[PDB]
Paper text:
In Drosophila, an RNase III enzyme Dicer-2 (Dcr-2), aided by its cofactor Loquacious-PD (Loqs-PD), has an important role in generating 21 bp siRNA duplexes from long double-stranded RNAs (dsRNAs). ATP hydrolysis by the helicase domain of Dcr-2 is critical to the successful processing of a long dsRNA into consecutive siRNA duplexes. Here six cryo-electron microscopy (cryo-EM) structures of Drosophila Dcr-2–Loqs-PD in apo and in complex with dsRNA substrate in the absence or in the presence of ATP were captured, illuminating the continuous conformational changes of Dcr-2–Loqs-PD after binding to dsRNA and translocating until forming the active dicing state and cleaving the dsRNA substrate into an siRNA duplex in the post-dicing state. Loqs-PD is a cofactor protein that comprises two dsRBDs that are responsible for recruiting siRNA precursor substrates for Dcr-2.
Similar to human Dicer, the N-terminal helicase region forms the base of the L-shaped structure and the DUF283 domain is located at the corner of the L and just below the catalytic active core. The previously unmodelled linker between the DUF283 and Platform domains (DP-linker) in human Dicer is now well resolved in Dcr-2 as a structural element that interacts with the RNase IIIa domain through two α-helices and one β-strand. The Platform and PAZ domains surrounding the Connector helix sit at the top of the core processing region. The intrinsic RNase III dimer comprising the RIIIDa and RIIIDb domains is located in the centre of the molecule with the insertion domains (RIIIDai and RIIIDbi) sitting in symmetric positions. The C-terminal dsRBD interacts with the DP-linker and shields the RNase-activity centre. Compared with the apo state, the overall structures of Dcr-2–Loqs-PD complex undergo major conformational changes when interacting with the dsRNA substrate, especially on the helicase and DUF283 domains. Although we cannot conclude whether the dimerization is an in vitro artifact or whether it is physiologically relevant, this finding helped us to solve near-atomic high-resolution structures of Dcr-2–Loqs-PD in the apo and initial binding states under conditions without ATP.
Numbering used by the authors:
A (entry chain B): 344 to 359
B (entry chain A): 1 to 1042, 1120 to 1149, 1169 to 1563, 1604 to 1722
Write the structure that this text describes.
């Protein structure tokens, strides 16, 4: 769809 | 005092040293270096290759899994080693052979390269003895497990004789395949068992990343971006369009074509020309899901290009139409992609925000999180300390991500201040940019620009993950899936920065299937680390004993008679410092080896006394005078053994005098202090010393010497009543007797002449070349002296007064202070006219000299005198001298004809025929003369006389209009005053000064020749002695003032001819046999060709170039300089052979220094007789019978403080009358006073402190000669003796100049031409090992064109100092020292004897070009003699390889171009090594030493240098004027040379970028700054080229 999913500053770099 | 040497030995050298000790496996993640360690491990086991298998010969085996790897290994072995190489891969017709030809090819090839199948076939069923193999190295050994053929080949080792097995080592870059790793210990133990050796890996903490690979870790998180199955309606449309194309692609209804079948024969398939479009469509379908649509567009563009190429290849019309339909479909797809790209990105109004929003929407969710995380990371962070890098998996993905990141960065100007994009690809190159299309240059610019800090981001498809040493990025970007252990570990290693950050790009659906994966990957990394930690690596090796543990109790220090204490702890430091003192190629100093002895060898050399103890041996490098090994005494631990070994080595070094009493290595200044009293003794009496504390500015380059006349001229005044010798002078006109020269020609052949009257007999003199205005003149002095006797004193007075009159009036060489030199002193000879006497014996012409004591005054005549004085008879004017008093009082005018048929009433002769003589004279004159009385008498034709007195110039100034203008000179006889002097004698006397000046030095040359021949014991020869006929002087006209398997298959035959195969396909004559012996060499051995020493040569050697003479002394200077250099080199090599090359070169330079030559020529009393001042006679010449007043000279010679203030104006202050100047001689008391108080007024005037000497030196007998001319004189004399009598006689003349000390014990200064090279009796060991080192020496000798009787010299000439295995011969520097002089003289003599049209001075530039080190390197590489150099030094290895590649790229052309500009880059990093050039000189010295034949050595040298000797003579490259005139095409800006007088001598300024950029350089020598400017200009051209 070339739109994918919109994501914002509510992101996490979670530990392995 | 404790200089640090922190274990500088390379890890590669340490690994190779470990490998030769015992079997093992080496693992290095770094891509580079494995090839070099393989080359070294091959070279260590390389001996015994020449010997046949039947007699114990061995070979070497290479194993590579893939054929490309084998090809690269073969190329590397060819380029790096001098061994015959094979290449046997797959099914290249090898399995269909016979045992006999296997054996034959094993005979042919030494090292054989191949894969597993061919080797298993060779060993299993066509068995070659595994015991007949030297070394078997394998590459990527980690491929061999289980049933892999490496395992089988290793298992075959268990069947053959286990006591004769070869050495096996396995190179590897990764220990595990990287797919999946479980049970690490079991796999590593299995790999340990497979190859009978351990895994060895360096753990250096300096530049290898091995220890940091496991001692550091960054934070580890994943982005955890959500993601689902990718779906796109555009992809669905593409699939539907492809289906619509395919449902019609089954009815091509094309013509019949051959049926194509698959290799596996599974099913029928379409031909390649028909299935190529299907394959490309499938590839594009794969690419859209992985790459996107921009990469899809570029890929479909490439597909369109390939389709166009194929259609150009195609012919059928129906196929063309179907292909056109396919092209239309592809173009429609490309149009759709580009429409989407150009439409979605700017589908909103706010461009500044939408340009970024669309990219945040264009990107996949993974890339979306990537972009926003990078945005928030560089929201405000400074660009000073930020850098990161993107890892992908596909080459095209690099370009795709690059375009995406460009669109992103140009969208956000804030990140443009902090972020810079790039992209990098490997194989399958596509257009990356507008510059550096090739992958290698693109990547080179990549790495240099990234490491220079210009950029901070790039994308690579694991290109840089191989282990590149790029800057440690603080964060790592890995977009593509990371399911691979090796690239994961190397990517983590890319994040070695402390406290750095690392992200993982895994989807949420992909997370549960990759968390466990990252778990085993991390635990396997840890397990590999802890498995390698306990291995015996380099650190655990005894090489880390620099800690110098405290064990001084059981080892003692040393003290000498001086009492200085030698602490054994400092032994290593002082040995390293001494190793720093010895000369080196600037490729790092050489550290002594410390190889440990085995217990069996320890018992072999020592026995029970060393049981339970360790002993070490030091291998002092061959450069130092120590050559034998030193064995430490036994004790407990290895560290104490090393300490004792170093202490004993230091004691030995001190015992032999390499260290002073302070136990510190000596320097050059300390060493020359031991030679000052032996060689440079003569400097002491002049106030100077060889120490040379200060130089340059403090040097005074001018000195004053007292000139002396030849002994014949001294005290040569004729006496009264005693015999006197008159030598008639003959003048021979060589020009044709033209009417213009008729007066000049005829008057020179008259019997009347003048003779030099002497009290001393004169020797024979050469024929004198003179140049009048009309043409050349030949002058010779009569051999037989016409003996006469002076009757009375009055006759002598008349002679002397006539002599004075000639100079005073006819030549006008007069000054107020001149007086007749009545007393008998220097230059006391006289000139006397001669007339035909009784019979044919000429007698003195007393009639003329009685009536011509002084020329009558140029009296005029009023008109009254003519009408009252009788008219002179016409015959009185024939051949006389007249004067046109009414127009030019002082001009003497020569009568050449009488015209009795002409009257003053006659008209003009031409061009004014309307005018008569009377009216012409009365119109241009009439005042001060009245009218003419005799209007009917005769007339005279007269010709002008030149005022020149110097006749040493070939060029003329005659003009044709002048030629008619001159003979029209007609004068009235009664209106001119005649001296009644014979015109012929006048015209002969006008040449007297030049003749006298040249003879004044011809006498000196003759006396010097007599002395030299007397010393050389050749005076009794018939050529020399009283029978010598001097040859006429020679004019020096040269003076200005006078796959790709086809290539490898066609290279296979050259491999049989080896690398050593000199091409010779085309001669170097195309850029656009028997050798002639040297005459000097020919007459050196046989006395039949001993040419007599001509005095013209000596006269040429005396006259400096300052004078305007027709011949110069510079031409002999070149030969003399080269001969002196060779003699000094050979003399020093013979006398001192244990010295290293540096001190020998320094002492040789000191012997041939200008100061030494000047000081050793001053005591020779020679320079006082040099011709070095231009002969201007009217101002700076003292005639023989003419001198200064005796009282004035007596006062002059007694008061130097007063003699330094006498000025020329004070000299004309003297007013001498005829009485004082003629009879009395001494000046009058009144005038003497007036002068002495007039001259002292100079101090009270502006004349005080002036340089009076330079203007009045000629009056005293002094001259100022620059210091260069004296050394040039000594060199010229050396050169002329060498040319005439050869080396065999000219060697011993240096004893005359005391340059080389004569050995009282033996007259060896004559036999020095045949001296040996040093220590030779101790090297008479068996030649089998010498041959072992010299593998394939036959080809080396063939290319060099000389077969060595003794191979020892060849081995010594090929030994680089960085080579430990050689122990019988010294380094190559000792031989190179001699070879330098040998080559220099053999080329200088050749060019001097063979080239004569070349300008002297340009021969020096030619000689410099021939002897240039870059030229020597070019010659050595061209003949491919570099493969045989024995060296162990990495940086030297790649520099030599790069230089070889650069040379071969040009076909070994020596046509100017770039490397002559790179001459600056000799010893911007270096680009040409000195060892490569110097090995040729060493080989030349070896050739000479082996045969002792100078002629054969010349044969070899000429065969080497023939092409460049042809080319350079045709157009000689130059340096100084070259850099001066080549820049001025668009850069005429230069600067003066700034003399510094320090380590750096000169500095220069210039401009770059044509004119607008100013760049300046410096120089430790004169040409160094010019070469630096040349390389800056070259770099500017590279910018212009780029």
């Amino acid at each position: 769809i070339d739109r994918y999913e919109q994501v914002s500053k509510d992101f996490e770099f979670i530990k392995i | 005092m404790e200089d640090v040497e922190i274990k500088p030995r390379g890890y590669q050298l340490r690994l190779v040293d470990h490998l030769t000790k015992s079997n093992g496996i080496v693992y290095l993640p770094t891509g580079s270096g494995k090839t070099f360690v393989a080359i070294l491990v091959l070279k260590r086991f390389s001996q015994d290759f020449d010997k046949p298998i039947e007699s114990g010969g061995k070979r070497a085996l290479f194993m590579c899994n893939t054929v490309e790897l084998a090809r690269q290994q073969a190329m590397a072995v060819r380029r790096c080693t001098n061994f015959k190489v094979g290449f046997y891969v797959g099914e290249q017709g090898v399995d269909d052979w016979t045992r006999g030809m296997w054996s034959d090819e094993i005979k042919k090839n030494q090292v054989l390269v191949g894969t597993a199948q061919v080797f298993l076939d060779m060993v299993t069923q066509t068995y070659v003895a595994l015991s007949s193999l030297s070394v078997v190295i394998i590459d990527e050994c980690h491929h061999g497990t289980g049933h892999h053929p490496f395992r089988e080949f290793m298992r075959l080792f268990t069947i053959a004789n286990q006591t004769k097995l070869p050495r096996v080592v396995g190179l590897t870059g990764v220990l595990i395949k990287g797919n999946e790793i479980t049970n690490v210990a079991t796999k590593l133990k299995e790999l340990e068992i497979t190859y009978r050796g351990n895994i060895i890996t360096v753990s250096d903490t300096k530049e290898m990343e091995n220890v940091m690979l496991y001692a550091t870790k960054p934070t580890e998180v994943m982005v955890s971006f959500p993601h689902q199955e990718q779906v796109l309606t555009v992809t669905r449309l593409i699939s539907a369009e492809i289906e619509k194309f395919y449902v019609s692609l089954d009815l091509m209804n094309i013509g019949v074509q051959p049926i194509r079948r698959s290799k596996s024969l599974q099913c029928l398939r379409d031909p390649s020309k028909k299935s190529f479009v299907k394959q490309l469509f499938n590839d594009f379908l794969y690419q859209m899901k992985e790459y996107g649509i921009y990469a899809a567009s570029i890929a479909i563009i490439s597909l369109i290009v390939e389709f166009d190429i194929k259609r150009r290849q195609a012919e059928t019309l129906s196929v063309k139409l179907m292909h056109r339909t396919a092209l239309t479909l592809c173009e429609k797809i490309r149009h759709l992609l580009v429409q989407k790209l150009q439409d979605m990105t700017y589908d909103d109004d706010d461009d500044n925000v939408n340009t970024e929003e669309v990219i945040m929407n264009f990107s996949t969710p993974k890339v979306q999180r990537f972009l926003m995380s990078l945005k928030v990371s560089f929201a405000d962070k400074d660009p000073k300390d930020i850098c990161c890098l993107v890892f992908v998996e596909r080459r095209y993905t690099c370009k795709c991500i690059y375009g995406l990141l460009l669109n992103y960065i140009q969208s956000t100007p804030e990140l443009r201040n902090v972020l810079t994009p790039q992209f990098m690809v490997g194989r399958n190159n596509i257009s990356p940019d507008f510059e550096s299309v090739l992958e290698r240059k693109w990547q080179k610019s990549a790495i240099q620009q990234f490491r220079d800090g210009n950029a901070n981001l790039m994308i690579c498809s694991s290109v840089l993950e191989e282990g590149i040493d790029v800057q440690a990025c603080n964060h790592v970007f890995i977009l593509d899936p990371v399911k691979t252990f090796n690239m994961y570990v190397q990517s983590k290693g890319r994040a070695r920065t402390t406290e750095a950050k690392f992200v993982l790009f895994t989807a949420d659906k992909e997370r549960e299937k990759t968390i466990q994966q990252i778990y085993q990957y991390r635990k396997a990394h840890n397990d590999i680390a802890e498995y390698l930690k306990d291995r015996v690596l380099e650190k655990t090796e005894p090489e880390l004993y620099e800690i110098k543990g405290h064990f001084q109790d059981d080892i003692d220090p040393f003290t000498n008679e001086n009492g200085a204490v030698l602490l054994p702890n400092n032994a290593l430091a002082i040995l390293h410092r001494y190793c720093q003192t010895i000369p080196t190629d600037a490729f790092g100093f050489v550290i002594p080896w410390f190889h440990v002895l085995q217990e069996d060898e320890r018992d072999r050399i020592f026995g029970v006394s060393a049981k339970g103890k360790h002993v070490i041996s030091i291998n002092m490098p061959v450069n130092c005078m120590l050559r034998d090994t030193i064995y430490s005494d036994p004790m407990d631990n290895v560290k104490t053994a090393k300490i004792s070994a170093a202490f004993k080595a230091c004691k030995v070094l001190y015992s032999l005098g390499e260290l002073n009493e302070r136990f510190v290595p000596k320097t050059l200044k300390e060493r020359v202090a031991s030679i000052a009293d032996v060689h440079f003794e003569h400097w002491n009496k002049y106030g100077d010393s060889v120490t040379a504390t200060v130089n340059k500015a403090d040097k005074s380059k001018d000195r004053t010497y007292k000139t002396e006349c030849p002994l014949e001229f001294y005290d040569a005044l004729p006496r009264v009543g005693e015999i006197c010798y008159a030598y008639e002078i003959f003048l021979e006109p060589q020009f044709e007797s033209c009417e213009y020269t008729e007066h000049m020609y005829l008057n020179l052949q008259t019997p009347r002449n003048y003779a030099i009257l002497l009290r001393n007999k004169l020797p024979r003199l050469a024929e004198m070349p003179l140049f009048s205005n009309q043409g050349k003149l030949h002058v010779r002095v009569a051999n037989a002296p016409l003996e006469v006797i002076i009757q009375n004193s009055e006759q002598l007075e008349l002679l002397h007064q006539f002599h004075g009159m000639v100079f005073r009036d006819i030549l006008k060489i007069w000054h107020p202070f001149f007086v007749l030199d009545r007393r008998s002193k220097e230059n006391s000879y006289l000139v006397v006219p001669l007339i035909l006497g009784a019979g044919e014996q000429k007698c003195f012409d007393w009639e003329l000299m009685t009536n011509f004591r002084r020329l009558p005054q140029s009296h005029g005549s009023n008109v009254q005198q003519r009408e009252q004085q009788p008219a002179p008879r016409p015959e009185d004017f024939e051949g006389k001298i007249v004067t046109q008093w009414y127009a030019n009082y002082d001009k003497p005018m020569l009568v050449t004809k009488v015209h009795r048929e002409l009257t003053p009433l006659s008209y003009m002769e031409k061009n004014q025929q309307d005018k008569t003589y009377y009216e012409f004279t009365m119109s241009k004159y009439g005042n001060r003369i009245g009218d003419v009385v005799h209007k009917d008498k005769f007339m005279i034709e007269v010709r002008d006389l030149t005022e020149q007195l110097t006749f040493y110039v070939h060029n003329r100034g005659k003009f044709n209009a002048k030629s008619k203008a001159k003979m029209k000179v007609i004068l009235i006889p009664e209106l001119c005053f005649n001296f009644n002097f014979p015109g012929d004698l006048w015209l002969k006397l006008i040449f007297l000064p030049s003749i006298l000046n040249r003879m004044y030095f011809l006498l000196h040359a003759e006396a010097l020749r007599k002395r030299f021949n007397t010393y050389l014991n050749l005076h009794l020869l018939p050529f020399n002695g009283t029978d010598y006929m001097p040859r006429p002087l020679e004019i020096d006209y040269s003076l200005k003032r006078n796959e790709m398997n086809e290539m490898d298959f066609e290279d296979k035959e050259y491999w049989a001819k080896n690398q050593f195969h000199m091409p010779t396909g085309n001669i170097y004559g195309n850029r656009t046999g028997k050798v002639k012996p040297l005459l000097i060499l020919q007459k050196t051995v046989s006395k039949e060709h001993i040419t007599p020493a001509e005095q013209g040569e000596f006269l040429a050697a005396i006259t400096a170039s300052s004078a305007a003479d027709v011949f110069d002394m510079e031409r002999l200077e070149i030969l003399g300089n080269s001969f002196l250099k060779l003699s000094a080199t050979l003399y020093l090599a013979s006398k001192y052979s244990d010295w290293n090359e540096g001190t020998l070169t320094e002492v040789k330079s000191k012997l041939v220094s200008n100061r030494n030559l000047l000081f050793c020529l001053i005591d020779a009393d020679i320079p006082k007789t040099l011709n070095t001042i231009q002969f201007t006679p009217r101002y700076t010449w003292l005639p023989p019978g003419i001198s200064l007043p005796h009282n004035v000279l007596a006062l002059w010679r007694e008061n130097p403080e007063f003699a330094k203030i006498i000025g020329p104006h004070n000299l004309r202050d003297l007013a001498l009358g005829d009485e004082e100047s003629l009879v009395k001689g001494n000046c009058s008391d009144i005038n003497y006073n007036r002068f002495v108080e007039g001259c002292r007024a100079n101090g009270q005037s502006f004349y005080a402190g002036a340089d009076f000497s330079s203007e009045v030196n000629f009056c005293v007998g002094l001259v100022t000669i620059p210091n260069k001319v004296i050394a040039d004189t000594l060199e010229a004399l050396l050169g002329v003796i060498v040319k005439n009598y050869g080396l065999q006689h000219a060697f011993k003349m240096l004893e005359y100049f005391k340059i080389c000390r004569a050995d009282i014990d033996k007259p060896l200064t004559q036999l020095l031409n045949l001296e040996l090279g040093g220590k030779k009796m101790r090297a008479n060991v068996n030649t089998t090992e010498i041959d072992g080192f010299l593998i394939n020496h036959y080809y080396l000798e063939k290319n060099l064109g000389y077969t060595f009787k003794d191979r020892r010299y060849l081995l010594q000439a090929l030994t680089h100092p960085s080579y430990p295995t050689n122990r019988i011969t010294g380094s190559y520097q000792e031989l190179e020292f001699i070879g330098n002089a040998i080559l220099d003289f053999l080329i200088s003599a050749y060019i001097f004897e063979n080239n004569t049209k070349m300008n002297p001075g340009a021969l020096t530039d030619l000689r410099s070009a021939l002897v240039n080190n870059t030229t020597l390197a070019c010659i050595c590489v061209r003949h491919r003699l570099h493969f045989f150099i024995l060296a162990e030094n990495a940086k030297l290895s790649e520099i030599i390889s790069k230089f070889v590649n650069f040379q071969e790229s040009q076909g070994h052309r020596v046509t100017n171009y770039v490397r002559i500009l790179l001459e600056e880059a000799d010893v911007t990093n270096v680009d040409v090594p000195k060892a490569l050039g110097d090995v040729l000189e060493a080989l030349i010295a070896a050739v000479y030493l082996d045969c002792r034949d100078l002629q054969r050595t010349w044969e070899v040298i000429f065969n080497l240098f023939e092409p460049e000797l042809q080319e350079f003579t045709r157009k000689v490259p130059i340096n100084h004027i070259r850099q001066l005139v080549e820049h001025k095409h668009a850069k005429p800006v230069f600067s003066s040379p700034i003399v510094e007088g320090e380590t750096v001598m000169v500095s220069c300024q210039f401009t770059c970028m044509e004119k607008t950029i100013k760049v300046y350089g410096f120089g430790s020598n004169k040409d160094q700054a010019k070469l630096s400017a040349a390389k800056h200009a070259l770099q500017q051209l590279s910018k212009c080229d780029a």
